C-alpha cells in the first residue's frame, strides 16, 4: 500500500480517512468509497486509485495553498462566505467565487473574473478584476392583467416602486430574497385575501435593457372570479379533539372569501393541538370550489401525530445563576409528555425574575425517537446589582441575584462624625419549594449630635424582622411576619406635632425649655400582598404589579399604631407589546395609633426626590416642623440656631426643616419613548421616559386649636407636581437613573432639585 | 512583581485535588448500563509537570532570518555563504562571553558558564553551550548545563528556549556582521 | 499606534514588551506583525505569541479563534499540542467566570458547557499526543472536568429529585451510568434512583439500585 | 404543622395513557408496534433485561398522586411475554 505524493497532509491523517484495512480486500466498491472519502477531506483537487500490485497504487494532485488573495472592508466577503489564507480553494470556488462577489457588489456594481496564477511550492495564488458597469433600476414593472383594482393601486407592497419623485428618501433598486419574491408572495395575498378564489400567477417574465440601463419585470394573471365562501368541513384525527376545532371553524356561510382567515384557522388548530402534546400537526386547507354556486367548500386535512414527550430541559447561557434557578421557575416537567403554553409559562417566569436578558426557548426533537424533545432555555444572563459609594462615608450596596442561588441580599452604612447607620436585609426565595420566601433585616440607626459628651440630642434606633412570604394563585403571593424597633431619644426640642405625639403617648415634657427623655420598644405584625404580572423583571413593556405591606402592633407594647401602605405599576404598550409604552404608578399610604392613638413620629411618610415626585429634595412635601421657643444647653459655638430665647425670640416659629405626616399620595404618569438617534439596536439596555410627577403629605392630626398664620397641614389640598425628562442606563456598575423636571406646583414645596442621579435601585 | 504570573496558569490549583475514578462493581445476575462513553481516559502514566509549576510561555521555533531552521535540541540548526567559520569566533567575543575550550580544527568550540538575563524569568538561568559547524555550511549549538539559581535543569521545556537563545545571539552577531 | 519600523525591530520591540510587558499593548504589536508578512517567517511564532498574550490578557473570545486558525491552519507538526492545551486551557477558563471564585461557592452546576468543550479538547490532546509535557496535566484536568459534568448530571438529579420528579430523576441518573459511571456524583446519585424508584412505586428496580448500592461502598 | 397547605401547581410525570389505549395491546406484539400508538417509554430496562415500563402519575392541586403503572417484559426476540398493570397504589 504505496501512496505518492502529497504536498501538505501526510500519511497519518490520509491513510486513517479511507477505510483501508491494510491487507486486504478486493471490493470494487472500495475504491469508489476510498475515492469517495479521499475526495470527502477536501485535500485534492484529483484523487486516483489503481493496482499495478499485489500492492494497491494511489494518486493524489493536492490542494492549492492560497498565497495571497488580491481583491484589486474589500476583503470582508471574502474572509467569510469565504476562504482567508489557508485552504485548499478549488474548482467549485471559481464558481460560486465569482457569482458570490457579483451579488455582493449591489449592496452599499461590477462583473468580476478570477486569476490564478500558479507559484512554486504549493500551487496558486489568486487575483479578482473587477469591471465598471453595468447597473440596473427598476425601470418600469407592471402586471397586465388586473382589471381590478387598478394596476397602481394593485402594486404597494413591500417593494419595488418604479417610480416619481418628489422628495423621495431610501431607495432605491431591489431584487431576489425578500424583493420581488416576497412582494409577489404580497400580491398572491392580496389577491386571495378579498375574494379571488382559485388565483394563479402564470411564470414571470424578467428581461433586461439592451443598454444595460433598466430592469422590467412582468406578471401574469388570470384572476378567477370571486367564490364568496360557504361552509366549512374538518376530516381527520384527533383526541385533541374536536369542539375546540369545530368552534375554530364558526366562520358563518354568505361571508366572501378570506384567505388569511384560513392561515389562521391553520395556525389556530396547531396552536390548540400544540397545548395538548402534538407538537407537529400536519395540517392543510383545500378549498373546493363551485362554479354554478357562487360558493366555496374549504377541506380541512388534520393529523395530530404522536403526542410529543420531554426528555431532557437544558439551560445554556448561565456562568453565574445556579441551574436550580432557572430549573425551579419552570412549569414543565422533564420525563413526561410536553405541551405548549407550559413552556410558555417558562419564559414567561424567567423574564419575570428579570435575573437574565434576554431569555429563548427552542423546542427541538431527538434524533430517532419520534416522540422525544428536547427544550432548550438560552439566556443572556444581565448584571444584577448595584453598588453605591457617596464619601462623611456612604456605601450601600444592591444585590437581587446574590452568585448562584438568588438570595436577594442588600446593605446600607453611612458614618461621619455626627450619624452611624446600618442596615442589612436578606430574603431568600423558594424556601423549602413552590415559591415560599423568608427573610430578615436588621436596622441600627444612631446618631447625637455634638457628642462630647452626652449634652445635646441623641437618637438611637435598633430594628430587626423576618417576614414569610408564599402564592396562593400563580402571580399572587402574600407575607406574614413580625419585627421588633427599638427608640431612644434624649433632648430632641420642642415642636408641635411631635409633641403632640408625646402628649398623648402619656408623657407630659415641659413645655419649651430644653431637653427631655423618652424611650419606647415596640413589637409589630406585618402583613403584605404582591401582584406581579409583567413583560420581565426590568424595563417592562407590558403588565403591572401591585404591592401592599401593613403593619400592626401586638401588646404588650409601648407604642401602639397600624400602618399600611400600596404601590401600583403599570405598563401599557401603544404599537404591539414593545417599543412605545406608556406607564403609571401609584404609592399610598396612611395608619394611625390605635386606643389613644398616636402614630409615632418614626413612622411617617415623606414624598419628593427621585423616589416620589422628581424636581424636589428629599423627605419634603407636604408637613414641616412648627416650632417653640427653648433654651439651647449649647448654644453658639459658631451654630446658628431656629428659635431659641436669646437670640430672642418667643412667641412660636416656623420652619424650613421638615417633619412628615401619616398620610401620602403620589402618582407618576411617565409617556416611555426609545431612545432618540444614534441607538445601538442593543439600546434594550437604556430607557428614555417623559413624565409627570404628582403627590403630597399630610398628617390626619391639625387645627382648628392653631388658628394661625401657619399652614394647614391636615388637607390634600394643595399637591405638588412636576413634568421632564428621565432616562435610566445600565452600567456595568449599576442602572443609572437621572431626571431632569418640575414644577407644575409648589405652592411651598420649599427646596427643589431639577437634575437628580441616583443609583440606585431607585423606582 | 513576581513575575511568575507570566509562566503559569489563570485559574486556581483546586483541580488537582479532585478525588480518583473507580468504576461500578456489578451486581450477580445483572449488568449497569451500557456505555457510550464518550468520555474516557486512557491510561498515561506521568511524568510531566502539573498546576502552577507547568510552564505555559510559548514554545520557541525562532530566530530564521537562506532562512528556515531545522528541529529543536538538544540541538541548534543555521543556500548558504562562502567560508571562514572565524565569524563564530568573531561574534562570540563581539559579545566579550567567555571561552575557555578552544579547538580551531573541526571549527567547533565550548562556550562557558557566562549567565543569561530574561524580564520573565523569576529567579535567573546560565549554562554552557557547544558551537560547531559542518559542511553547504550550517552552524549547530547545542547544550549541556544549566543552571537555575545554581540548580541543573533537565527539562524539555526550557531546553529549547535557552538553545535557542544563545542562538539567537548567534544569529543577530552574524547577521550584523554578515550584512 | 504602532510604527513602520522595520519587521524585524518590531517584533523585538513587542517581545521585549511581552515578556515583561502588560501584554495588550505588545498585543497590538504582535497583531500588526501578523498583518504584514502574511505567510512567514515569523508568522507562526507571531501567531503562538497572540496566542499566549491573548490568553493570559483574559480576551479568551479571541484566543479561542486565533487557535482556532492555527491548528486548522498548519497541523503539521510540531508544535500543536501546545495550542491545543490552549484551546482547552481556555475553554476551562470560560468556566469560572468569576468573583466566585473568591468565597467557597461550588461551580458544579451553572452552565457546562465550556467543561464539555475543554473536556473534548483535552481529550483530542491526549489522545492523541501522550509525550509533550502537557498531558499528564491536562489527563488531571480530564478527570477534574469528568468529575464537574457528573455534579452538573448529580445537582440536576438533586432539584427534581426535591421536585417530585422521580421518572426524570431516574433518566438523570440512568444518564449518568450511561456516561461517567465511574465518577463519585454517579455513586452518590444511586440513592437518588433508589428513592425515585421506590417513590414511584417499583420496588424490583429498587432492589437491584440497592443491590448495586451494596456491591461497592466509596468512592 | 401543616393540616392544610397552599400552594403548588401541578406535576406530571410519566407516559401518557389514556385507558382505551392500553386495552390495544395484545400478547405477539412486536415491541415496534407497542410503540405505535402507547409511546416511546420515557422509563425503559436497565439493569440487564428487557421491560418497558409506561408510568401514569399525577400530582394536581395539592389534591393528591394518582399513578397507573404498566411494565411490559419482551423476550430476547422483541416479542412481549409479560404484561402487567397496577393501577392506583398502596
Known sequence: IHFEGLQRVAVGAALLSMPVRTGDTVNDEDISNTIRALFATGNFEDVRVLRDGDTLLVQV???????????????????????????????????????????????VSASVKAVVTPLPRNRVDLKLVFQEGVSAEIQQINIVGNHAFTTDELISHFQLRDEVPWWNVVGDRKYQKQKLAGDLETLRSYYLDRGYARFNIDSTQVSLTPDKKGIYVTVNITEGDQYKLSGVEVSGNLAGHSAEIEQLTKIEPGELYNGTKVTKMEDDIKKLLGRYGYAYPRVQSMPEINDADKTVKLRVNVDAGNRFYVRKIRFEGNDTSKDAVLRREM??????????????????????????????????????????????????????????????????????????????????????????????????????????????????????????????????????????????????????????????????????????????????????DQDNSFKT????????????????????????????????????????????????????????????????????????????????????????????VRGFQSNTIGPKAVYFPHQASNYDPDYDYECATQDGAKDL??????????????????????????????????????????????????????????PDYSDPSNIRMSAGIALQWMSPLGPLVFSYAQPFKKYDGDKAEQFQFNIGKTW | SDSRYKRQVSGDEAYLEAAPLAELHAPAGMILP????????????????????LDIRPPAQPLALGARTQFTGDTASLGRGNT?????????????????????????????????????????????????????????????????????????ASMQRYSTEMMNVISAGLDKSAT | EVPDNPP?????????????????????????????????????????????????????????????????????????????????????????????GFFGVDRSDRDPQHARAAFSDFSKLVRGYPNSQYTTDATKRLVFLKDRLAKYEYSVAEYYTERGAWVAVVNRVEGMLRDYPDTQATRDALPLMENAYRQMQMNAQAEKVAKIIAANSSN | TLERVVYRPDINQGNYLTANDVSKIRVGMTQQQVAYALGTPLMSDPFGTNTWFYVFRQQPGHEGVTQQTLTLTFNSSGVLTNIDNKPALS
Open chain 1, 61 to 107: 494532485k493536492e490542494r492549492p495553498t492560497i498565497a495571497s488573495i488580491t481583491f484589486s472592508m474589500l476583503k470582508q466577503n471574502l474572509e467569510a462566505s469565504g476562504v482567508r489564507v489557508g485552504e485548499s480553494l478549488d474548482r467549485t470556488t471559481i464558481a460560486d467565487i465569482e457569482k458570490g462577489l457579483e451579488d455582493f457588489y449591489y449592496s
Open chain 1, 331 to 512: 412549569r414543565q416537567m422533564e420525563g413526561a409528555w410536553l405541551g405548549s403554553d407550559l413552556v410558555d409559562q417558562g419564559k414567561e417566569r424567567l423574564n419575570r425574575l428579570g435575573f437574565f436578558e434576554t431569555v429563548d426557548t427552542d423546542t427541538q426533537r431527538v434524533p430517532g425517537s419520534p416522540d422525544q424533545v428536547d427544550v432548550v432555555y438560552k439566556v443572556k444572563e444581565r448584571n444584577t446589582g448595584s453598588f453605591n459609594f457617596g464619601i462623611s462615608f456612604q456605601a450601600g450596596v444592591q444585590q437581587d441575584n446574590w452568585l448562584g442561588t438568588g438570595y436577594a441580599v442588600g446593605i446600607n452604612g453611612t458614618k461621619n462624625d455626627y450619624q452611624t447607620y446600618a442596615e442589612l436585609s436578606v430574603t431568600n426565595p423558594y424556601f423549602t419549594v413552590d415559591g415560599v420566601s423568608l427573610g430578615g433585616r436588621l436596622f441600627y440607626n444612631d446618631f447625637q449630635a455634638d457628642d462630647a459628651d452626652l449634652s445635646d440630642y441623641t437618637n438611637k434606633s435598633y430594628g430587626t424582622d423576618v417576614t414569610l412570604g408564599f402564592p396562593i394563585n400563580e402571580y399572587n403571593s402574600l407575607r406574614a411576619g413580625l419585627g421588633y424597633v427599638h427608640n431612644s431619644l434624649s433632648n430632641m426640642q420642642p415642636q408641635v406635632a411631635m409633641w403632640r405625639y408625646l402628649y398623648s403617648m402619656g408623657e407630659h415634657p415641659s413645655t419649651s
Open chain 1, 521 to 612: 420598644d415596640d413589637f409589630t405584625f406585618n402583613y403584605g400582598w404582591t401582584y406581579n404580572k409583567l413583560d420581565r423583571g426590568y424595563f417592562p413593556t407590558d403588565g403591572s404589579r401591585v404591592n401592599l405591606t401593613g403593619k400592626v402592633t401586638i401588646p404588650g407594647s409601648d407604642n401602639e399604631y397600624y400602618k399600611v401602605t400600596l404601590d401600583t405599576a403599570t405598563y401599557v404598550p401603544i404599537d404591539d407589546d414593545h417599543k412605545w409604552v406608556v406607564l403609571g404608578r401609584t404609592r399610598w399610604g396612611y395608619g394611625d395609633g390605635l386606643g389613644g392613638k398616636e402614630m409615632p413620629f418614626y413612622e411617617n411618610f415623606y414624598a419628593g426626590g427621585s423616589s416620589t
Open chain 1, 653 to 710: 416659629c416656623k420652619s424650613d426643616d421638615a417633619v412628615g405626616g401619616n398620610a401620602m399620595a403620589v402618582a407618576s404618569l411617565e409617556f416611555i419613548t426609545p431612545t432618540p438617534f444614534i441607538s445601538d439596536k442593543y439600546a434594550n439596555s437604556v430607557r428614555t421616559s417623559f413624565f409627570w410627577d404628582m403627590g403630597t403629605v399630610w398628617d390626619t392630626n391639625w387645627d382648628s386649636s392653631q388658628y394661625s398664620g401657619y
Open chain 2, 34 to 53: 451500557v456505555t457510550s462513553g464518550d468520555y474516557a481516559i486512557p491510561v498515561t502514566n506521568g511524568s510531566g509537570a502539573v498546576g502552577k509549576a
Open chain 2, 84 to 156: 571562514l567559520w572565524p565569524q563564530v569566533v568573531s561574534v562570540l567575543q563581539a559579545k566579550n562571553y567567555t571561552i575557555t575550550q578552544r579547538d580551531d580544527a573541526g571549527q567547533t568550540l565550548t562556550t562557558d558558564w557566562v549567565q543569561w538575563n530574561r524580564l520573565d524569568e523569576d529567579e535567573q538561568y546560565r549554562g554552557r553551550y557547544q558551537i560547531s559547524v559542518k559542511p553547504q555550511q550550517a552552524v549547530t549549538v547545542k547544550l549541556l548545563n544549566l543552571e537555575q539559581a545554581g540548580k541543573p535543569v533537565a527539562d524539555a
Open chain 3, 8 to 100: 524585524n525591530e518590531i517584533y523585538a520591540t513587542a517581545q521585549q514588551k511581552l515578556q515583561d510587558g502588560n501584554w495588550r499593548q505588545a498585543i497590538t504589536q504582535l497583531e500588526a506583525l501578523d498583518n504584514r508578512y502574511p505567510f512567514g517567517p515569523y508568522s507562526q511564532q507571531v501567531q503562538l505569541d497572540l496566542i499566549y498574550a491573548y490568553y493570559k490578557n483574559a480576551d479568551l473570545p479571541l484566543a479561542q479563534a486565533a487557535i482556532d486558525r492555527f491548528i486548522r491552519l498548519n497541523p503539521t507538526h510540531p508544535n500543536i499540542d501546545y495550542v491545543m492545551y490552549m484551546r482547552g486551557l481556555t475553554n476551562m477558563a470560560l468556566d469560572d467566570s468569576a468573583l466566585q
